[PDB]
Amino acid sequence: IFSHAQVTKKNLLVTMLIDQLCGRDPTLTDELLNILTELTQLSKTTNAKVALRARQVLIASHLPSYELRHNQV
């Protein structure tokens, strides 16, 4: 209960820790994928920002990071 009461502040921390881990490195191992796909399932509106940002990571980590396209083309 106590830790749940400060959910918004925790969400700020969660987003900062996502951006420093899956930022300029669009790759996801099969340990982070489990977390991200679990995190996007928080449907309550209090935890939207984390579920949104996680989604942005998970969907963005399928496009080649512009070196592959440059080289192949």
């Binding site: 209960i1 106590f2 749940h4 009461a5 400060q6």
Partner: protein
């Protein structure tokens, strides 16, 4: 009970020699307390002693402290 009767912040008011001081007290950990007055904050390491008192570390110096609450005084 709802999750606003289990607060982590306390407002404290204390008058000394006619001067009123208003402070907020919160925690960064079970032992790390933060005292805030007029937008300035100080960190204190607090440990609970078995004898009812508190062991503080404030500005390097440590202290052992005790409080008794009276009807109209601390």
């Amino acid at each position: 009970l709802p999750a606003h009767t289990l607060l982590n912040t306390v407002d404290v008011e204390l008058i000394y020699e006619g001067v009123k001081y208003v402070l907020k007290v919160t925690r960064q950990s079970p032992n790390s307390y933060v005292v805030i007055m007029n937008g300035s904050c100080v960190e204190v390491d607090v440990h609970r002693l078995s004898d009812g008192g508190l062991l503080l570390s404030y500005d390097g110096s440590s202290y052992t402290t005790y409080m008794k609450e009276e009807v109209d005084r601390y």
